[PDB]
């Protein structure tokens, strides 16, 4: 447990120092692709649960 | 249940079109793998924009 | 969270507001990451952001 949490704290600190590894253009590619998928799938967003909800 | 999934998977293979025919030199490939670190590499900032597309 | 004397209880200067807004636009919704960077409590900088 102690070792694992150490290397953990290491990886967090290295993720803050070294910045996001996903770069940028890649991330845009992901977001865009997902957008196209949900588009062709007619998926309507899930709204917030209303105060009156019978279920 | 998972084992029933195994059954759907086998008969799913066996029901494919001309699946076992090696006459012309056809070649089948089964591939099993893991995403290795997946949970650990999810980026929160990205995950937020990804969820904004859903809910 | 609160009683610790090292915690800073006072108004936010202009620099702290610039820094808080910029960072909050940088890493949305992450308060426990931002709070140490500006030197304030997460709940406090939340309240100040809203």
């Amino acid at each position: 447990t102690r070792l694992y949490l150490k290397a953990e704290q290491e990886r967090q600190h290295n993720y803050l120092k070294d910045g996001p590894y996903i770069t940028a253009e890649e991330a845009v590619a992901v977001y865009t692709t997902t957008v196209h998928w949900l588009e062709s799938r007619r998926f309507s967003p899930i709204p917030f649960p209303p105060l009156s909800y019978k279920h | 249940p998972p084992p029933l999934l195994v059954y759907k998977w086998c008969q799913g293979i066996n029901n494919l079109q001309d699946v076992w025919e090696t006459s012309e030199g056809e070649c089948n490939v089964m591939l099993e793998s893991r995403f290795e670190k997946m949970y650990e590499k999810i980026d929160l900032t990205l995950l937020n924009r990804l969820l904004r597309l859903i809910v | 969270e609160w009683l610790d004397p090292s915690i800073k209880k006072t108004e936010w200067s202009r620099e702290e507001e610039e820094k808080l807004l910029h960072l909050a636009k940088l890493m949305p919704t992450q308060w426990r990451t931002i709070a140490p960077i500006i030197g304030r409590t997460a709940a406090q900088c939340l309240e100040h952001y809203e």
Binding site: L16 | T45 | M27
Partner: peptide, 27 residues
């Protein structure tokens, strides 16, 4: 004076990269 030793009174007994900006503004 140099070899004054701080008493070891016992308690038992951060920076950020700017790439986050480029990413976030990109998204």
């Amino acid at each position: 004076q140099e070899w004054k030793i701080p008493p070891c009174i016992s308690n038992w007994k951060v920076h950020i990269n700017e790439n986050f900006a480029k990413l976030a503004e990109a998204l």
